[PDB]
């Protein structure tokens, strides 16, 4: 049973100008990703401080990146709080109707699209270098979902069956054709080491 819903008009329009402006630093997704990521470590790490039987689903708090030449999918995964049903449908829990608006009055006022992370809909410059996202997440208190869009206005949500991952969330970028520098190792490590090297959790590289 899959479930599809409309975006919201101002994400319609934020990934809209994600996928059509000609911005040639897409790197900074990868940023984005490991913040939201890191984000959601620290939100997991501060519940177990009071309730520690919030680490019963898994101890080890990380982000790994896994490269697939094969399928030409990047993946993020990580081992934060993760998102329940309703926070994948509420724009994957972030403010993103007033998030986009500050945005774009941001942008007005001199800012680039390597901004975005400042106003909450960091996860959406993954469209920056996929042509679909996949989003597979376990959060405590709810059942395993996959969330996915190619944009056009639409995602769908399901319940993921398959390869149940504990807690946390996996992001899974289908990359567009003309991006496949972005399963390159030395790319990666590139990218990680100019945006990414202060993040207070171990970031494991793949490799295949
Ligand atoms: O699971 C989350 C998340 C991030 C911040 C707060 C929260 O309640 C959940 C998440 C959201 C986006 C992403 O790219 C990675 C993630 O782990």
Redesign the pocket.
């Known amino acids: 049973e899959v479930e599809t819903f409309a975006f919201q008009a101002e994400i319609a329009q934020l990934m809209s100008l994600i996928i059509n402006t000609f911005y040639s630093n897409k790197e900074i997704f990868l940023r984005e990703?490991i913040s939201?990521?890191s984000?959601?470590l620290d939100?997991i790490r501060y519940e177990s401080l009071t309730d520690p039987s919030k680490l019963d689903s898994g101890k080890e708090l990380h982000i790994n990146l896994i490269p697939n030449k094969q399928d030409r999918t990047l993946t993020?995964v990580?081992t934060?709080?993760?998102?329940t049903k309703a926070?994948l449908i509420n724009n994957?829990?972030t403010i993103a109707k007033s998030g986009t608006k500050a945005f774009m009055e941001a942008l007005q006022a001199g800012a680039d699209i390597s901004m975005i992370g400042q106003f909450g809909v960091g996860?959406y410059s993954a469209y920056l270098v996929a042509e679909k996202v996949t989003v597979i997440?376990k959060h405590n208190d709810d059942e395993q979902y996959a969330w996915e869009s190619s944009a056009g206005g639409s995602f769908t949500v399901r319940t993921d069956t398959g390869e149940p991952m504990g807690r946390?969330?996996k992001?899974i970028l289908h990359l567009k054709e003309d991006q496949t520098e972005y399963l390159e190792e030395r790319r990666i490590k590139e990218i990680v080491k100019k945006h990414s090297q202060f993040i207070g959790y171990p970031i494991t590289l793949f490799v295949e």
């Open positions: 990703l939201n990521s984000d959601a939100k993020i990580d934060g709080i993760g998102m926070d994957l829990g996860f997440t946390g969330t992001v």
